[PDB]
Amino acid sequence: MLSRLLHGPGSDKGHGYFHPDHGLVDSAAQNIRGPYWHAENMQFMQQETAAQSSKLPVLSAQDGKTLQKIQLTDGSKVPKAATLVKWNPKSVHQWHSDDILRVDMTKHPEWVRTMRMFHGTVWRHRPEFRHPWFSRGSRASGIIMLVFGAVAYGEITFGKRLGGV
Amino acid sequence: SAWNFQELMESRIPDYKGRPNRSGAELEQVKAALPKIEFMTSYEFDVLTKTRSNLTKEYSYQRDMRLKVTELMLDEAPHELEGLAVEGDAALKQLAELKALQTLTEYAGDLLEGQNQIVQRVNDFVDSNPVYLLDQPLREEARWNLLPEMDHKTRSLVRTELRDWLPAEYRQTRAVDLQQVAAFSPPVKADMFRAIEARAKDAEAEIRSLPPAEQAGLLALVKDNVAKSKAFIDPTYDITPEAINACNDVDALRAMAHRVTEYSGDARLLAIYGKAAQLTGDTAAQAILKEAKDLVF
Amino acid sequence: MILNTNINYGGRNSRLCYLIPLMVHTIFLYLAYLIYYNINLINIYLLLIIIIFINIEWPLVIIYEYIYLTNYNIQNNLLYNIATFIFLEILLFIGFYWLYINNIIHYPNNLPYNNNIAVNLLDHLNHNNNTDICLYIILHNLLLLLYVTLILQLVHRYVQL
Amino acid sequence: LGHMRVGALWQSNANSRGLPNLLKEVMAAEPIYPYTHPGLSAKQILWNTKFNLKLEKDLISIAESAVQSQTVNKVVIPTMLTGDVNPKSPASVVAKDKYQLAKQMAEFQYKKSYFEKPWGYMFAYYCDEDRARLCGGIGYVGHHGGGDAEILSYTEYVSTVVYPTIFYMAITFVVSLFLMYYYIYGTFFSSTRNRF
Amino acid sequence: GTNPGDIALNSKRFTVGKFVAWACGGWGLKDWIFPSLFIGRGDGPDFDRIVKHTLQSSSAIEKVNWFDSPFACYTEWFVEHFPGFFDSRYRFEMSAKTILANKYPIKDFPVVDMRSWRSSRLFDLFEVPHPEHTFVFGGPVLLNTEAKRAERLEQEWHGKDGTFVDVHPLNVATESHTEVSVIGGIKVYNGVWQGGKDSWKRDSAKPELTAPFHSPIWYRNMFIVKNADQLVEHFGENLSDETWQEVRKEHLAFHERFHKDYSFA
Amino acid sequence: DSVHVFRPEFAQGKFRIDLDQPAKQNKLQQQIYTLTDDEREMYEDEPYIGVDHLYEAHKGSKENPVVVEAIGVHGNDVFTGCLGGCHKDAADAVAYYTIVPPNTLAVCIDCGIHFVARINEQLTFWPDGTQPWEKVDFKAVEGFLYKHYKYGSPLMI
Amino acid sequence: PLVFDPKRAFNDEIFLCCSLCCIIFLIFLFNQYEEFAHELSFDIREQFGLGFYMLLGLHGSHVIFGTIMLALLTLWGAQGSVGPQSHALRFTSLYVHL
Amino acid sequence: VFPSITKPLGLFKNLPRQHRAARDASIWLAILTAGPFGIFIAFKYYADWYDKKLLMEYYKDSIVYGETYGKGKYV
Amino acid sequence: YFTRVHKYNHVPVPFILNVGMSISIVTSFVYFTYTSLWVRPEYDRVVDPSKAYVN
């Protein structure tokens, strides 16, 4: 099918676009309401809150109650005392529940790098300027290339290669 | 699968289905569950919900702001009109004072417009960030759906919550229509007329405590104000049953019936149409009027 | 509070608007000088160091713009540009294959040697056989690249799921 | 730094020029109250404003007290289709009987005398003023158009201009074919003359 | 037009500017030797034409508030280049005054300026020279996004039934309304608060603070947009077509003595 | 039995603005399509639904105008337009654009339609991860809005 | 603090795959260089030799660029910056497949 | 103009009207292409036939091409 | 309003113009095709086996 090859509906023009069976999934839905195409074979776990992180620079912007409502887990082994809650498709609210166990993904290197880009450096409108010495090297390279070009033009035209003087 | 040209959210095509297919048992169950329903003509709903006084459909806080600004402007008028000097006769001085008053009012009109714009901007912010002003479960239903795309119950709940998030002086609720409430409640009209007469008498006393020429000018103004205030609250206040009984012209009775129908369509229609039927011998009309006074009124 | 503009990536001023052209100019004048005097005006390793250093700006700006300026419109633009670049590379390969096969599809050819039959035991396979082309090692390299393709496709799909 | 602006109040710039105040443009240095409040001086206008303001306050208070402390005897819920934000307006803007026709005719006569001819003359002045603004070598006024232009509808134009033109083109085509063939070869159906 | 600047320093026969123009473009010996052909009348105000247009005017010139308006600095340009300027301006101002003296509560005034012209190409709606950054906050918004979509064709494109597109369940519920009122003992539910599109009426008009509550006066400036390539105007409820044709005839009949003595060559 | 945690999308800024309110942003960036030639033919011969159009006031009347909403800066003129042919005598070949002051009643005297182009500013919380996760009140918002009205705020470019 | 974590880096699938692909690409480059010098008899100054060598040299240049891309993606995957929907991953996959 | 060939032939009756019109357009595109190809192929085959006829009527009594061109065996 | 659909603005061709244009175009095509493909006489062959010469 040309339509399906070029990322279209396919044979049926009223058909959708996503085929999560072969890896064509919806990132927006996953980020907002979680991967509801894994809903049949995955279940939320229900029962260490997040209040211990209420004093950190980036999490201090939240209220105490908000962090108290969040319950954490080690994220490796199943808590044997934790019940299982069925994951209901077509329900946009279950991914945001406070009764389900969660995992503190605030020590992830990507998390730290993002928040540092926002909370750990002086804001520069130009990412190249966010690195001072590299910008220095780059402008120096530009000047070097200008000089090299001028010298090469001078040498090739006049037939003397500047090494004997 | 190695590519992904998705968008933030696919467009939504409505599914129409149709009116429910309720069987006989379901039909009887529904009919036994309804209240005592009175089906209303579109004219009745129109007169109930017509725009009469609040011409611009301005909310409460906008009217309050306008009245407050008028008070503040009046409290400053004598200072601005004091000491004006211009070369000319009395008429030229009067025109100079009129221009000064106009400048004062144009100055005050801009502050009011600025404040209206600021409150409108606050409310625009409320709409622009709805998920940050809502609790669960309405938050996700405001996140995923637009106003036209919400269920009626969820739509109403979301709008009410967003309105109530604001302070009392920013909530956008339509102001009361004086003429409407007077037209659909006979006591309210009587109270309004009593208030008009009380203010007229008090103003007449205040005027009578003033020098002569001002007395005549202000008394004429008071008469005009009372007349126009009455015509504003109830344009048909002169169509009394005494006047109806005193009227023996078919065209005049038709005019009265039209004027009442425009205003409220109340039992005075029964009176006018009964007197028209008697003067013309319309037995069918008399039967219809009996039915109306039994049911309509 | 911030004021939100259109989805379109507004754009930033950058030094890459002239650094890359100056890099191309440097490379071409380097080639011209090497052609004229048969010697290098600047050491080749130093030249490659300059070239590499100039182009480190792309990943940095890419990182800091993904962190801050990205949405599905921008991602679609970028992916379509990637597709067009792949198309250009395919066309380049097609042109070079045209160059290669021009004199091979045209079977008749004036050869320094004999290729008729019944004169020697091997003449009849002189023109139709370049028997030194390292076929066994070419097949080994083919196996390596098939490994890479299949493994990469598997991993890509696995993470995507 | 130069003259940095203080605050962020509205300034007329390229992106925004504001909403003109035609009333002040027209009634410049002339009072408006002789038209809105004829016959009244400033003191009378202020006194009337105060009296009416107090009266309006009283009426508003009465109305709010009434609406906020009345017992509900009936509940009116209009019918609307599912998925519809607001019910359809039950008011019609078309006269139905002859009395409504006479009423709307009187209203139309008043509006014509007092609201439509003013609009027409204002718009005519605006068009002429735009012409004057673009005149004098600034823009392309007078290069085409005018009151003598012959404006034709689609049917009239196609029937009286397009088809005859194509007809003349076709006749020219045939005549030129024959004449050119004769001119070059010297014959009409025999190719070169004195050769074949 | 053009602002000559300092007339004094450009009148001299020999000038650095004239020599530079000769060298590079704009001047030459043809101007020094034959000014009557290559300079001639030049470009500037025509005093005689201004006097003629002034003295052809009626007493409207006395009764117009033009000389106190902010555009009074353009009096000579419009007197010269707009024949019959004062009579047309007087009609314009009297039209505004009669709209002001109406019996309607809302006085609508038509506004036309450089923005009142539509165009099919977006670069024609900007001021020249164009701003550095344009359409920063997105592009145009089409009014057609507020019209009902082609539901039938939309269903048909997808291969959906669409049989009952015009048959919808009725809805009579209190949960569907947020605007509740009490009108004479009757609790009326009607409408939902939508937001910024429910307050278009008040945000468009400005009140006269001195007008009483029983005789309100509101001022509204109605903007006008036209294509200028249409040749036919349809004002809607503001002006009927028959009245507009009447106004056209009368305007062309009155403003004829100001136009008949000139040729367009 | 095992526990899985899907890797979240950490990007902030424009992406997090898009993912916080996907309905509004999609509305801003959702393409809609116009009718082809056969579709125009099939639409022009569809029937009206009821006799309401003979009595009611059309959409685009002096009392029922076409209100439209753009995003931008307060007071900036709004860009709006027709697709052409709102009237029989109006052109329909291509879309026709318009520049109009905000929050004012404008009338197109080509078609005769009254419209209310108006601006809503997209003031949103600084997206750096400090956005609030639970219902917020009017105090902090009051301060931010006061500062924006008095002085202005940066643009998300 | 931001500290490199070899445990997490080695427990990540993208880092392993890209490193393995970069290693195989380097092996391929070395092998192909070993047949250009000490295997063949014809040089780039012949009829078939020139076209063949131009083709394989262009392919080798593209392989070098792909090796650089795979190394960059290995660096980003070690840091944990490459997500499932990464256009960098998409570009490298498409380029390697090409 | 281009009337829809599928309507008077009853093809693609299960498709919505838009897609049926698309098929009609494809069919018309197919028809318009086959015209010039048909004209030129007809002319070429007529030219080959005429060449065979000429070689038959000229090399009928020849001794060199009396059996190849004369009979038309390898014209 | 779609004003360019098939139901609007149909202008019938006057009979005289129709006849003239049809005759003109038919005559043009016939004459050109005739003189281009049928009046080619420079492709002349003379069959004469008695004009050969051999020493």
Ligand SMILES: CCCCCCCCCCCCCCCCCC(=O)OC[C@H](COP(=O)(O)OCCN)OC(=O)CCCCCCCCCCCCCCCCC
């Ligand atoms: C992808 C690309 C593939 C590669 C390309 C392949 C080829 C492309 C297309 C090939 C076809 C081209 C046109 C073929 C027609 C012309 C050849 C022909 O029909 O020849 C017949 C005739 C020979 O007759 P002759 O030998 O002159 O006379 C013998 C006794 N009188 O011929 C003559 O008389 C020749 C003299 C006239 C020459 C001028 C043009 C004549 C064309 C038509 C001739 C026949 C007339 C029939 C048509 C009616 C016209 C009114």
Ligand SMILES: CCCCCCCCCCCC(=O)OC[C@H](COP(=O)([O-])O)OC(=O)CCCCCCCCCCC
């Ligand atoms: C600037 C344009 C130059 C290119 C030439 C194009 C000329 C097109 C003229 C077509 C006239 C036309 O409308 O054809 C329709 C009529 C049939 O009439 P009806 O069915 O519309 O009522 O059909 C007829 O009337 C038959 C006449 C068609 C003959 C073709 C035109 C001959 C003119 C050639 C000029 C070079």
Ligand SMILES: [Zn+2]
């Ligand atoms: Zn329009």
